[PDB]
Design a protein around this ligand. Structure first.
Ligand SMILES: [Mg+2]
Ligand SMILES: [Zn+2]
Ligand SMILES: [Zn+2]
Ligand SMILES: [Zn+2]
Lengths: 204, 133, 49, 51, 49, 66, 339, 263, 113, 185
RNA sequence: GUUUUCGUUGUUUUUU
């Protein structure tokens, strides 16, 4: 079942995750009291520039009102203006705008909202398959360090650029404990003459 | 508290990009060379060209968290038609007899340019502008 | 293994927008804030909590 | 297997049934096994002959 | 890990030292990282996963 | 497969119309007028029935273990 | 949408944002408009979220003191006199308001003002809302035909250049060979076509048009974006070049040999509204794949560049003396930035 | 002072004209009827034996979505308000289903008629599944192949749209006012002109068309509010409306209660 | 695996109250009221009702977080009436309005069908 | 001064509608395949079978490779077959035909929308959006959730995903019809 | 019984 953070995409490259889920009463409604299933960011259009998404939504409204399957074959002779005229014939605004009424207040939102159906697709990426926290878990047999992989309680591999940025950040103790307590740490007994680990050691 | 009093005939008006506010420019009926330019909410108190408006510049309307305006507090404002609160943001101590008092009423800009001493008392911070038709 | 190696008390997850949240905070899942922990030494002031 | 070296890898792969198209399109790939020995954009860039 | 706990905050890649930022943990539900919009711009990242 | 019990966009009782919808289809009938006959007024309810894809008939034509 | 001169708010909404404003002292100031009805302006609402003690002043485009366009900029002690706040001041630009709070009050105050503006904007847009529509992306037919004739005139200039080159009447450019001069000048001409069409489309953008409102707001998008969506995409320039004749002396079998005219060499004659012909669709595919491959390739080299540069100077530190030295103590510079 | 002139009425759909009320109050009422009006929906499903080719979560969730005739859902006690361990009839109506197919080549169509109300605290007629109507054999639930069985028991408890759309008394509620934008609440965004690009509502005939000469009165407030309420059959339009009104009344009463409770 | 629960949107926990009033000395005769288990439906209604009260000098509310069914409402009244008392008055006024609404609706429903 | 025939395995061909290239008839600049052939195909058989190989071997449609393609001039749509001789902002553009007053296109594609791919035949108007976004669509289409096979249950696979309520898109292509996307949406 | 026990090579595809 979808949850905040779940990944989805359109048929126009329009990809994103869920940011928040709101119930029926809080989101604005139409003159007929109709609310959308989903809400998107306008900022995609200036940047991502998906005109075909607009054409798809318009044709979707027209088909849903008229009750038939709309065609969107590329390199065809369809014209958006005619679809707008038909939407006028559908008794709806030719450019698809319609007054929303703030769900919290019922007040007519000043702008008329372009509001209608679109065909979207669920995507394999979920949120809860990546949530993964590790304070201490299994360690690799050789490295004596936290294992890698969300399957086996993997640890966060601290990249070298992260080290460099921490160094520029003056994080001496923080990075040290990341390499001392959060990473491998063994104590040994070395010689003062040869200066090597060549010492049979026994604490007890 | 009515420091300055005058009446102006409106020579030009323009809304342009803005729809609810027009900048209006007029000459004073009482004395020429007294030019008044004010941004006004048109639909709330409309004026037109050559319109004669009774302008009053007051230092204090009380004769502080703003409250629903109680009728128990009488205002010289009630004597006028459009009343607008602002801050005198530059007292233009410039020409020999042209003080150019600029007052910003929350964004609505006003230029009262005219007589040196006639506008000298307007060397204040805030201001009330009061308009009869 | 030396200039790059894994650490503990580290988590990696999705990011979401919180317009009502402060700039210098991250909305942390209860899973992350629970599994990840800090060792607080028992002192005279924190003994109760 | 003895000649593990100098062997091409990927010509046969597990069929995906995540979705129906994950099979159909999967059955109509083509590949150019040149390798990144020399990066180049010509093996990756669309050409008019690809029309 | 309580609320307002300072934690190192890391994204890959991390070019500028401003890509390492210490945010206060705000223990709140959902399994994402809830952030301010403005703090995302220096990261030059988005919530597309 | 299987029309939703409740209309996703709206929430109207819609489930007990599928057989009726097929009945309307059989007489070489237009789609929109038939949907209107099905009391489908909101075009959300309208395309929910118009564009539903039932799939159990292929699943059921599999001979089950029992 | 908020700072504008003709933005008006009523007692209830005012009081609600005041409760929303973290930096409100419980004291609402006197509304600028009082009679025949108390009304409030965007500037006062801005100043509410702003803690006092901040002044800014920037003449914009040589604007006057009476600011008829609400351009310019003047905040006094946290109160905006004139001028609409823009991303040139609220963004990351130097000398900006964020710069100002950095160099006058500190980072905590900037964090506070972020929350202030963010929550008050959440309220105000939640209650107003701003969107986009197809009618916003379209301009009246007059500008559409201006676009069409601009493209046609550019095509005629292209054909003239074709004729001059094909009869060597094209005068040689300095450091630019005859055929390549032809290609480059036609490229310039067709880019001028796309930009002229786009500027016409931008001019026909209206006040309620959320497209020009988007760019003026600057939350995203730009001039060339509108130019491509509404007017025409323009030539698909790959690595600063023109789509060549991929086949034998032709870019497509639908075009002919030496088809020097724009349609056979990658100049887009459509906008994203109109949709593109299959040939020029394939040309835009050329440009898009060019961009994606550029990014993908640049990844690895930019990476190793970064790593080797980090390795290069990993220990330069200004010592307590103030001199920049190495771990050997040999001074690189006796002082940081000479100062 | 609250004035209504009901344009039209029906079991599910009603068009009302609530005049002389607050916009905030009207929206609060609309929200209350949309979410806070209780109905009955299946909240627990036991599968005793199932030989179909569909997931049991599928059929269970669908069964929850089924509205139940709930004119008396108020008398039903909540699963948390009722003190009994497990379920009793007073807080839980039991439904039953048992269907088979034997004809080899064929399919048994399980309908909401098969959902048999086998409990319901006498009387409290809640739990019988809503349908289109009687001749309609019910909401279709499953399709049975050769030797396939659906045997299910169901527990329905009092609930609201706020906790699940399966308890939702309404699909959507239409709320309107000022049928000519005479109060200036929307811009009439336009490419050419504002009045002609934007149509005239079904309530344009009801209120006066604004006088072109008449300058906008900047003090008038929305007073006449048009309402359209529809139900799914679990409740009736009048029932939902009255329940919403009374529920917001008791909400205010509890607000009072806690006000003098604190003091 | 971390999202919050749904019945808590109206079910009162033992530790926190439905109504938590604290004095808002920020302006005289002002208080801050924390309504748990609440949202815009009652909040905007009470806000408008108090705004219609002449004694009420400041009235506002805010749902501090949409991911929590709760809100807080700041209420200042004139020097005569207390914010809490204005709140009971607003609640009772909306009570009587709802009574009239239900009565008129029921009457004309009966006469209609 | 050369000529070359290729029959080696691996050369890929597309069926081109055969516009008469020998200038000896009005069908020059028109299609040998006509509504007679279309009707015969619509029958599914021949009016004494007319299959796809029937069209191919009838000389009205032929296979072409890229090496052949660069030596042939092809018409895009049925509009520019016959060499032709206002101000609409909702139409596309064919070659200008200003100096080259004549064009004898030796062939025409069955459909320009057939330059697409199996995934590309899904997008509603992929020609009104940026090519990078078209590529992103192509990439994401294979990893989009849906319903893969009818007997998913009898298969014991590492991962299986089935939608509760598959829905046919409101916006459709015509190659969609061939893809049976109503049946596996 | 406090405590308490999995890994790698190679291969493919991937993820802003
Ligand atoms: Mg990322
Ligand atoms: Zn030694
Ligand atoms: Zn619907
Ligand atoms: Zn009980």
């Amino acid at each position: 079942v979808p949850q905040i953070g779940d990944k989805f995409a359109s048929r126009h490259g329009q990809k994103g995750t869920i940011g928040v889920t709101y119930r029926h009463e809080d989101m604005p409604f139409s003159a007929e009291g109709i609310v959308p299933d989903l809400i998107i960011n306008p900022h995609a259009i200036p940047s991502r520039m998906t005109v075909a998404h607009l054409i798809e939504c318009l044709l979707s409204k027209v088909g849903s009102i008229r009750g038939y399957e709309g065609d969107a074959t590329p390199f065809t002779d369809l014209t958006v203006d005619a679809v707008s005229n038909l939407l006028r014939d559908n008794g709806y605004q030719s450019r698809g705008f319609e007054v929303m009424y703030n769900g919290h207040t019922g007040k007519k939102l000043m702008a008329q909202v372009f509001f209608g159906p679109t065909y979207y697709q669920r995507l394999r990426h979920m949120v809860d398959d990546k949530i993964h926290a590790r304070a201490r878990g299994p360690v690799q047999v050789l490295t004596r360090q936290p294992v890698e992989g969300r399957s086996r309680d993997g640890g966060l591999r601290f990249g070298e650029m992260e080290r460099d940025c921490m160094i520029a950040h003056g994080a001496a103790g923080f990075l040290k404990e990341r390499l001392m307590e959060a990473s491998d740490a063994f104590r040994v007994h070395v010689c003062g003459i040869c200066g090597l680990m060549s010492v049979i050691a026994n604490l007890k | 508290s009515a420091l300055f009093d005058d009446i102006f005939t409106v020579q030009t008006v323009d809304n342009g990009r803005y729809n609810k506010v027009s900048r209006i420019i007029g000459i004073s009926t009482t004395n020429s060379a007294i030019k008044l330019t004010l941004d006004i909410n048109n639909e709330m108190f409309p004026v037109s060209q050559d319109d004669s408006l009774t302008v009053t510049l007051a230092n204090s309307l009380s004769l502080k968290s703003w409250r629903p305006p109680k009728p128990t507090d009488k205002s010289l404002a009630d004597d006028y038609d459009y009343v607008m609160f602002g801050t005198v943001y530059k007292f233009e101590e410039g020409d020999e007899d042209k003080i150019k008092v600029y007052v910003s009423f929350g964004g609505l800009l006003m230029c009262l340019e005219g007589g040196y001493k006639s506008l000298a008392s307007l060397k204040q911070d805030n201001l009330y502008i009061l308009i009869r038709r | 293994n030396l200039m790059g190696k894994r650490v503990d008390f580290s988590a990696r997850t999705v990011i979401s927008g919180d317009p009502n949240l402060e700039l210098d905070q991250v909305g942390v899942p209860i899973s992350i804030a629970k599994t990840l922990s800090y060792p607080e030494t028992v002192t005279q002031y924190n003994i109760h909590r | 297997q003895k000649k593990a070296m100098s062997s091409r890898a990927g010509v046969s792969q597990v069929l995906n049934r995540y979705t129906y198209s994950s099979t159909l399109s999967h059955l109509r790939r083509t590949n150019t096994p040149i390798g990144r020995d020399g990066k180049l954009a010509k093996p990756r860039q669309l050409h008019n002959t690809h029309w | 890990l309580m609320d307002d706990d300072p934690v190192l905050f890391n994204r890959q890649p991390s070019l500028h030292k401003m890509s390492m930022m210490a945010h206060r943990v705000k223990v709140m539900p959902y399994s994402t990282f809830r952030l301010n919009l403005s703090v995302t711009s220096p990261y030059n990242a988005d919530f597309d996963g | 497969m299987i029309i939703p019990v409740r209309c996703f966009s709206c929430g109207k009782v819609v489930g007990d119309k599928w057989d009726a919808y097929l009945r309307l289809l059989e007489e070489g009938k237009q789609e929109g007028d038939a949907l209107d006959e099905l009391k489908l007024k909101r075009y959300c309810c309208r395309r929910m029935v118009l564009t539903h894809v039932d799939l159990i008939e292929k699943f059921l034509r599999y001979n089950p273990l029992e | 949408k908020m700072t504008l001169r003709d933005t008006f708010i009523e007692y209830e909404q005012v009081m609600n944002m005041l409760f929303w404003v973290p930096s409100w002292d419980g004291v609402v100031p006197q509304p600028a408009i009082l009679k025949p009805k108390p009304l409030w302006t965007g500037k006062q609402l801005l100043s509410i979220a702003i803690p006092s003690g901040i002044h800014l002043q920037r003449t914009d485009g040589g604007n006057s003191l009476l600011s008829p366009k609400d351009n310019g900029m003047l905040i006094v002690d946290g109160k905006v006199m004139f001028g609409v706040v823009d991303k040139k001041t609220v963004g990351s630009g130097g000398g900006g308001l964020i710069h100002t709070v950095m160099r006058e009050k500190g980072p905590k105050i900037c964090a506070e003002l972020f929350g202030n503006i963010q929550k008050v904007v959440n309220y105000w847009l939640l209650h107003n809302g701003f969107s986009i529509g197809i009618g916003d992306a379209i301009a009246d037919a007059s500008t559409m035909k201006e676009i069409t004739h601009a493209i046609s005139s550019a095509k005629e200039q292209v054909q003239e250049i074709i004729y001059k080159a094909q009869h060597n009447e094209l005068e040689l450019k300095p450091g630019m060979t005859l055929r390549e001069s032809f290609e480059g000048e036609v490229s310039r001409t067709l880019n001028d076509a796309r930009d002229s069409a786009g500027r016409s489309a931008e001019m026909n953008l209206k006040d309620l048009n959320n497209v020009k409102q988007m760019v003026s707001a600057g939350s995203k998008g730009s001039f060339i974006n509108i130019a491509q969506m509404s007017a025409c995409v323009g030539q698909q320039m790959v690595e600063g070049k023109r789509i060549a004749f991929g086949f034998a002396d032709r870019s497509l079998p639908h075009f002919t040999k030496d088809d020097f005219s724009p349609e056979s060499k990658g100049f887009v004659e459509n906008s994203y509204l109109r949709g593109l012909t299959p040939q020029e669709f394939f040309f835009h595919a050329m440009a898009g794949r060019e961009g994606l491959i550029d990014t993908a390739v640049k990844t690895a080299e930019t990476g190793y560049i970064q790593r080797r540069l980090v390795k290069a100077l990993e220990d330069i530190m200004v010592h307590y003396d103030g001199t920049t030295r190495n771990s050997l103590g040999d001074i690189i510079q006796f002082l940081y930035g000479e100062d | 002072e609250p004035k209504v002139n009901i344009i039209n009425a029906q079991d599910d759909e009603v068009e009302l004209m609530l005049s002389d009320v607050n916009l905030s109050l009207a929206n609060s009422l609309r929200r209350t009827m949309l979410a806070e009006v209780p109905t009955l929906a299946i909240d627990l499903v036991e599968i005793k034996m199932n030989t179909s080719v569909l997931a049991d979560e599928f059929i269970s969730h669908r069964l929850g979505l089924i509205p139940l005739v709930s004119e008396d859902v108020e008398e039903m006690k909540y699963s948390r308000d009722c003190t009994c361990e497990d379920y009793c009839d007073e807080c839980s109506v039991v439904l039953e289903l048992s269907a088979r197919h034997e004809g080899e080549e064929g399919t048994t169509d399980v309908y909401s008629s098969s959902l048999i109300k086998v409990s319901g605290p006498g009387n409290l007629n809640v739990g019988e599944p809503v349908r289109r109507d009687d001749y309609d054999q019910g909401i279709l639930l499953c399709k049975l192949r050769n030797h396939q069985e659906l045997n299910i028991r169901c527990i329905a408890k009092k609930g609201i749209a706020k906790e699940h759309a399966k308890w939702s008394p309404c699909s959507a509620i239409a709320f309107e006012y000022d049928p000519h934008n005479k109060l200036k609440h929307t811009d009439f965004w336009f490419e050419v002109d504002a009045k002609k690009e934007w149509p005239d509502s079904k309530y344009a005939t009801w209120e006066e068309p604004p006088k072109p000469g008449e300058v906008f009165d900047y003090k008038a407030k929305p007073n006449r509010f048009y309402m359209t309420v529809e139900t799914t059959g679990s409740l009736k339009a009048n029932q939902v409306f009255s329940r919403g009104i009374k529920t917001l009344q008791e909400k205010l009463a509890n607000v009072l209660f806690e006000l003098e409770n604190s003091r | 695996m971390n999202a919050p629960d749904r019945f808590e949107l109206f079910i009162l926990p033992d530790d926190v109250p439905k109504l938590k009033i604290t004095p808002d000395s920020r302006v005289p005769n002002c208080i801050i009221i924390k309504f748990e288990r609440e949202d815009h439906t009652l909040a905007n209604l009470l806000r408008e009702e108090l705004a219609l009260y002449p004694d009420v000098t400041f009235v506002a509310y805010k749902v501090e977080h949409p991911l929590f069914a709760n809100f807080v409402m700041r209420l200042q009244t004139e020097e005569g009436t207390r914010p809490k008392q204005a709140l009971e008055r607003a609640c009772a006024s909306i009570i009587n309005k709802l009574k009239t609404l239900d009565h008129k609706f029921n009457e004309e429903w009966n006469i209609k069908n | 001064r050369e000529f070359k025939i290729f029959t080696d395995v691996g050369r890929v061909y597309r069926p081109l509608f055969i516009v008469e290239d020998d200038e000896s008839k009005d069908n020059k600049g028109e299609l040998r395949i006509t509504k007679e052939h279309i009707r015969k195909i619509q029958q599914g058989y021949d009016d004494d079978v007319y299959g796809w190989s029937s069209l191919v071997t009838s000389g009205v449609i032929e296979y072409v490779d890229g090496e052949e393609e660069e030596t042939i001039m092809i018409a895009m749509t049925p509009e520019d077959l016959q060499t032709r001789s206002l101000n609409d902002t909702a139409k596309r553009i064919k070659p200008e035909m200003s100096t080259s007053s004549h064009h004898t296109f030796t062939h025409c594609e069955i459909h320009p929308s057939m330059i697409l791919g199996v995934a590309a035949s899904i997008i509603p108007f992929p020609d009104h959006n940026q090519s990078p976004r078209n590529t992103y669509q192509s990439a994401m289409g294979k990893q989009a959730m849906g319903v893969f096979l009818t007997n998913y249950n009898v298969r014991m696979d590492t991962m299986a995903n089935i939608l509760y309520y598959p829905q046919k898109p409101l916006a459709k292509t015509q190659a969609m019809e061939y893809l049976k996307f109503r049946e596996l949406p």
